[PDB]
Subunit: 26 residues, 4 copies
């Protein structure tokens, strides 16, 4: 439920952002 | 991984959004 | 603040998910 | 666009996360 969602975001969002930026450059 | 973050975007984020909206009208 | 964030997510998240899936296949 | 969604991931999503956490402890 909410708590596991938050925890995935907190940990996993920074890598996602990096990735997406890379992909966009390419 | 991206894969884990990606599954939360598709299922836990939408429900979280609806949650936030409920709490804002309270 | 929160309301503009939500509104960007609601509208913009489905396209983001599609995109990311495509990129991952490639 | 992705570009618009991407800026919200980087600035409005983190603050929203902190918000949710405040509301959950209430």
């Amino acid at each position: 439920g909410i708590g596991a969602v938050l925890k995935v975001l907190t940990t996993g969002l920074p890598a996602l952002i990096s990735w997406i930026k890379r992909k966009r450059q390419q």
